Design a protein around this motif. Structure first.
Motif, mmCIF file in Angstrom:
data_model
loop_
_atom_site.group_PDB
_atom_site.id
_atom_site.type_symbol
_atom_site.label_atom_id
_atom_site.label_comp_id
_atom_site.label_asym_id
_atom_site.label_seq_id
_atom_site.Cartn_x
_atom_site.Cartn_y
_atom_site.Cartn_z
ATOM 1 N N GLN A 1 1.185 8.697 -9.745
ATOM 2 C CA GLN A 1 0.247 9.766 -9.365
ATOM 3 C C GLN A 1 0.820 10.543 -8.102
ATOM 4 N N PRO A 2 1.021 11.882 -8.232
ATOM 5 C CA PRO A 2 1.370 12.678 -7.058
ATOM 6 C C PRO A 2 0.422 12.389 -5.872
ATOM 7 N N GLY A 3 0.468 13.206 -4.843
ATOM 8 C CA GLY A 3 -0.463 13.129 -3.737
ATOM 9 C C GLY A 3 -0.273 12.022 -2.732
ATOM 10 N N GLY A 4 0.486 10.985 -3.062
ATOM 11 C CA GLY A 4 0.367 9.765 -2.274
ATOM 12 C C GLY A 4 0.636 10.167 -0.875
ATOM 13 N N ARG A 5 -0.104 9.754 0.149
ATOM 14 C CA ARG A 5 0.381 10.085 1.512
ATOM 15 C C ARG A 5 0.245 8.970 2.555
ATOM 16 N N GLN A 6 1.416 8.407 2.844
ATOM 17 C CA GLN A 6 1.571 7.121 3.541
ATOM 18 C C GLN A 6 1.239 7.112 5.052
ATOM 19 N N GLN A 7 0.090 6.588 5.447
ATOM 20 C CA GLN A 7 -0.281 6.567 6.868
ATOM 21 C C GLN A 7 0.394 5.346 7.586
ATOM 22 N N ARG A 8 -0.317 4.673 8.526
ATOM 23 C CA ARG A 8 0.153 3.469 9.286
ATOM 24 C C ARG A 8 -1.024 2.880 10.136
ATOM 25 N N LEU A 9 -0.870 1.708 10.794
ATOM 26 C CA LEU A 9 -1.615 1.369 12.074
ATOM 27 C C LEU A 9 -0.566 1.607 13.174
ATOM 28 N N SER A 10 0.713 1.648 12.712
ATOM 29 C CA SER A 10 1.982 1.616 13.511
ATOM 30 C C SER A 10 2.708 0.218 13.464
ATOM 31 N N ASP A 11 2.233 -0.688 14.361
ATOM 32 C CA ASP A 11 2.529 -2.150 14.390
ATOM 33 C C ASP A 11 1.459 -2.958 13.548
ATOM 34 N N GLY A 12 0.650 -2.287 12.710
ATOM 35 C CA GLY A 12 -0.177 -3.003 11.751
ATOM 36 C C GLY A 12 0.279 -2.861 10.295
ATOM 37 N N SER B 1 0.466 -0.345 -6.418
ATOM 38 C CA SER B 1 1.607 -1.252 -6.540
ATOM 39 C C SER B 1 2.682 -0.876 -5.495
ATOM 40 N N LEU B 2 3.323 -1.853 -4.839
ATOM 41 C CA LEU B 2 4.521 -1.536 -3.992
ATOM 42 C C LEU B 2 5.939 -1.738 -4.682
ATOM 43 N N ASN B 3 6.998 -1.986 -3.903
ATOM 44 C CA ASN B 3 8.353 -2.224 -4.456
ATOM 45 C C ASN B 3 9.059 -3.439 -3.790
ATOM 46 N N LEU C 1 -10.344 13.385 -12.266
ATOM 47 C CA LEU C 1 -10.367 12.252 -13.202
ATOM 48 C C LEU C 1 -10.823 12.688 -14.559
ATOM 49 N N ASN C 2 -9.922 12.985 -15.480
ATOM 50 C CA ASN C 2 -10.364 13.476 -16.757
ATOM 51 C C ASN C 2 -10.389 12.442 -17.839
ATOM 52 N N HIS C 3 -10.651 11.179 -17.490
ATOM 53 C CA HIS C 3 -10.555 10.026 -18.413
ATOM 54 C C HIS C 3 -11.758 9.028 -18.271
ATOM 55 N N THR C 4 -12.479 8.789 -19.383
ATOM 56 C CA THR C 4 -13.727 8.046 -19.374
ATOM 57 C C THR C 4 -13.561 6.770 -18.596
ATOM 58 N N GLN C 5 -12.456 6.068 -18.847
ATOM 59 C CA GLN C 5 -12.094 4.846 -18.118
ATOM 60 C C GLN C 5 -10.702 4.940 -17.667
ATOM 61 N N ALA C 6 -10.361 4.301 -16.552
ATOM 62 C CA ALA C 6 -8.991 4.324 -16.110
ATOM 63 C C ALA C 6 -8.733 3.423 -14.995
ATOM 64 N N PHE C 7 -7.502 2.957 -14.961
ATOM 65 C CA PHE C 7 -7.172 1.883 -14.076
ATOM 66 C C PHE C 7 -6.281 2.372 -12.965
ATOM 67 N N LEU C 8 -6.539 1.886 -11.741
ATOM 68 C CA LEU C 8 -5.932 2.479 -10.579
ATOM 69 C C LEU C 8 -5.165 1.411 -9.938
ATOM 70 N N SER C 9 -3.875 1.608 -10.013
ATOM 71 C CA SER C 9 -2.919 0.584 -9.724
ATOM 72 C C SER C 9 -2.294 0.976 -8.424
ATOM 73 N N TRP D 1 0.987 4.867 -6.435
ATOM 74 C CA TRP D 1 -0.314 4.922 -7.000
ATOM 75 C C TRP D 1 -0.017 5.198 -8.406
ATOM 76 N N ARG D 2 -0.732 4.444 -9.217
ATOM 77 C CA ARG D 2 -0.743 4.705 -10.618
ATOM 78 C C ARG D 2 -2.168 4.734 -11.265
ATOM 79 N N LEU D 3 -2.207 5.446 -12.398
ATOM 80 C CA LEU D 3 -3.326 5.528 -13.325
ATOM 81 C C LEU D 3 -2.917 4.779 -14.572
#
Ligand SMILES: *[C@@H]1O[C@H](CO)[C@@H](O[C@@H]2O[C@H](CO)[C@@H](O)[C@H](O)[C@H]2NC(C)=O)[C@H](O)[C@H]1NC(C)=O
Ligand SMILES: *[C@@H]1O[C@H](CO)[C@@H](O[C@@H]2O[C@H](CO)[C@@H](O)[C@H](O)[C@H]2NC(C)=O)[C@H](O)[C@H]1NC(C)=O
Lengths: 299, 168, 299, 168
Positions: free
Chosen positions: C45-56, C77-79, C67-75, C38-40
């Motif tokens: 961004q800390p906090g990320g917490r990776q769930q699953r469907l399992s086989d989904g 992104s994977l690897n 959110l201390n920013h009038t505008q901001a972009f929420l990215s 997760w990016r701004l």
């Protein structure tokens, strides 16, 4: 109470008109009998000739010889007392049909990003007359009829019209003429055939001085972004500032130069320089000269 | 008097204003059709039957009002319906005519309310009128100079009735 | 490839937001397994917490603290390689809900023939916020609700609105306030209650000199046609031109005068005079002073 | 050469022009969404399957043309259909995008006609395309930086192919 009707409300130059007054006896103290009198506003008009139904309405018809007045009011008035009573009135105009619009021309403005045509409509018609810029995508000599014709309409009064990019087909040829109609006729300018791109109006680069031998100069000029994309040829001209000297043109230049040196001058220490441009191997027209730049020579 | 100073002066303003209004229209008919003299149209007048408003319950019939404002008011209302039925006349006029229409309208209700604020207003607000024709261009061209010219006096009388009503 | 979704895209001040990234395994070389980050915008961004469907699909949720920013972009992104791959992006704003608009006021302009209200919107909200001038015909204190409410909308940016004659009811009272809404809330100014006619802005007559004793003056002033129809009261003030003298006000005047004489002055031969007006027994406000007129005294 | 000097120079103009066009869009995506690097979007790229145009029938495959203009042209036509399918992206862009759309269009037919004026033009003018999705805001936001960025090179190659085609 009665009711005027005419042949033509608008008419040529100085022709005749002919009207009827059907004065109904259904409302009239002294019944239509008091002769109905034709006026051109406060002017008795000869010719009046009083017909009848007999036991009906007591009409009259008349013929205006030559209407020699751009506008004029036609008063069909009878007589009740010592006072004339207008019973109907009607407006009559006369003027000319329009002439061929002289001197149609176009530019492409790289900023508005659109094509600006304009013309001269010459002689005033004395009549509400609308102009219009028709245009069409073609190819070739435009003869080979392109089909979709596009009306571009000028703003009341103004004598030029403007076609935005979305309706141009750059690098291809279109036909353009002006149509002029009032209620006596329509006329057309000769048709133009062009590629908006060969009528592009450029704007010259702005000359400026430098930073880092004798009888010499150094200047520089920065582009005109909008035109950067168009290989153009420029020329510089210069003459010493005071004196009534003759301008000296210098060879072919590029549209932009980070450093230029002009030698062979008099350490006359005072020359005026201006440059201008024009799209080069491709068709195009020159550009106004840049504002002037003044600078002294080395010595 | 039982008529608030303010209300009366507000009424007089509106008059002077509508007078102007009329006069603009009159002078802009006179230049746009050369119809300057509403004498010439007298006949035309009857030819259509333009119910003109009367206004003689006030001039000095005593010193009892309401039923008078009443008449006043009704007149205003009538003209307002003639000017309406004038249909803007012609495009070049239309705006001139339309300011008068509006202003007259407002004098018209400036009264009506004062009349409710004294009880003498019928509860029920008229919407009547048997409005003349004015089909043709000329009818309206003239219609205009006619109505203007009547209204214009209906006002000079209301003026009197008020400048004098403002000293009881 | 995956798809972001949030609670709230726009939000208060400095609050939290919470989002989901549902990264689908249907397109992905190294299958979503490489943790989605997760990016701004260019900021992990800390906090990320990776769930699953399992086989989904291999989703993650996260919580932005404040959110201390009038505008901001929420990215989201994977690897894939040594390179982060944006797979969805989303825009997040935050600001304030609007404040009560301070200092609403109106004029009637006798020329435009319309009513011009304006206000101050104070503190910037950081959010697309539309204003609006509501108004209604009433009578009385406006309390007694008039019913039809009329929205008059200002031109983007501008902080005043204008109601044309056809929608006014002169000599009667209307209610007017400004409404202000962005997507955090709506606020309202206090409501105004007025008769357009008592807010008419006048324009002063223009003083001028004359044509036909000592220590005296003669001037004259011609009306302001638009106002002629409104009994107004004026005052003249005058003080000698040089010197730092104090302005002297003169009694009550009329709106127009063909000849006025001002005596009791010093043959000081140089006074400044200005006059202004205001609608009189009826309510109204003063007018700017006329431009000045200068003239000498008799001797 | 069998390619008129003028035609070629007209082609180069248009290129320089469309390049600008691209670049404006690219730089106005970069400020309006902070998407400046079309690396990051590679994945997204395939995720949608953006058929990119090829252009290797000209670079120097011999010295026979037509069938080459052909390819060129088809590319142009393809991008033109991608930019279309970009749907103006977002209101703040839309105009920037729309000038490029238009200009590209025109380079596209500047070729096609030259191709008819040499016979090598099919009589029949294509209208094909299996255009990708770009449903979401982001798809188009990115879609844009992607396509721009491909087009942008498709051009640098056409440039070469022409600046060099202008010396046979
Ligand atoms: C092309 O049209 C553009 C837009 O009008 C013109 O640029 C303006 O020039 C006028 C008058 O000389 C100025 O009043 C404006 O300030 C210019 N810019 C804008 C943003 O309006 C231009 O002169 C027209 N013709 C040319 C030579 O490009
Ligand atoms: C009322 O609105 C009228 C119309 O704007 C104003 O009159 C104009 O005043 C402005 C700016 O001071 C001038 O730029 C214009 O030339 C005026 N006339 C026209 C025809 O536009 C007026 O100032 C506004 N307020 C007042 C005091 O009447």
């Amino acid at each position: 109470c009665g009711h005027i009707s005419v042949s033509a409300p608008i008419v040529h130059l100085g022709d005749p008109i002919t009207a009827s007054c059907i004065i109904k006896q259904n409302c009239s103290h002294l019944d239509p009998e008091p002769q109905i009198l034709w006026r051109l506003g406060a002017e008795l008009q000869p010719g009046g000739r009083q017909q009848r139904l007999s036991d009906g309405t007591q009409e009259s018809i008349i013929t205006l010889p030559h209407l020699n007045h751009t506008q004029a009011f036609l008063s069909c008035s009878l007589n009740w007392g010592n006072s004339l009573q207008i019973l109907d009135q009607v407006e009559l105009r006369a003027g000319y049909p329009p002439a061929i619009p002289h001197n149609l021309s176009c530019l492409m403005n790289l900023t508005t990003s659109s094509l600006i045509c304009q013309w001269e409509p010459g002689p005033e018609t004395h009549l509400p007359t609308s102009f219009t810029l028709k245009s069409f995508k073609s190819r070739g000599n435009c003869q080979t009829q392109g089909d979709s014709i596009l009306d571009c309409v000028p703003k009341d009064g103004q004598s030029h019209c403007s076609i935005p990019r979305k309706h141009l087909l750059l690098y291809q040829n279109m036909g353009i003429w002006v149509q002029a109609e009032n209620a006596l006729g329509t006329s057309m300018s000769p048709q133009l055939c062009l590629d908006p791109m060969d009528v592009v109006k450029l704007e010259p680069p702005m000359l400026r001085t430098m930073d880092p031998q004798a009888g010499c100069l150094q200047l520089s000029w920065e582009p005109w972004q909008p035109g950067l994309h168009i290989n153009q040829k420029c020329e510089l001209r210069h003459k010493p500032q005071r004196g009534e000297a003759s301008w000296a043109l210098v060879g072919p230049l590029p549209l932009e130069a980070l450093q230029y040196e002009l030698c062979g001058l008099l350490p006359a220490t005072a020359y005026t320089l201006q440059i201008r441009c024009i799209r080069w191997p491709l068709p195009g027209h020159w550009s106004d000269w840049s504002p002037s730049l003044e600078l002294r020579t080395t010595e | 008097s039982s008529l608030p100073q303010s209300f009366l002066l507000k009424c007089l303003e509106q008059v002077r204003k509508i007078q102007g209004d009329g006069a603009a229209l009159q002078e802009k008919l006179c230049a746009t059709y050369k119809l300057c003299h509403p004498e010439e149209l007298v006949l035309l007048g009857h030819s259509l039957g333009i119910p003109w408003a009367p206004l003689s319950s006030c001039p000095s019939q005593a010193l009892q009002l309401a039923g008078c404002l009443s008449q006043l008011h009704s007149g205003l209302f009538l003209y307002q319906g003639l000017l309406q039925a004038l249909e803007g006349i012609s495009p070049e006029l239309g705006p001139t005519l339309d300011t008068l229409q509006l202003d007259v309208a407002d004098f018209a209700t400036t009264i009506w309310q004062q009349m409710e604020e004294l009880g003498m207003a019928p509860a029920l607000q008229p919407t009547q009128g048997a409005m003349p024709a004015f089909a043709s261009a000329f009818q309206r061209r003239a219609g205009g100079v006619l109505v203007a010219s009547h209204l214009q006096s209906f006002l000079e009388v209301s003026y009197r009735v008020l400048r004098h009503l403002a000293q009881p």
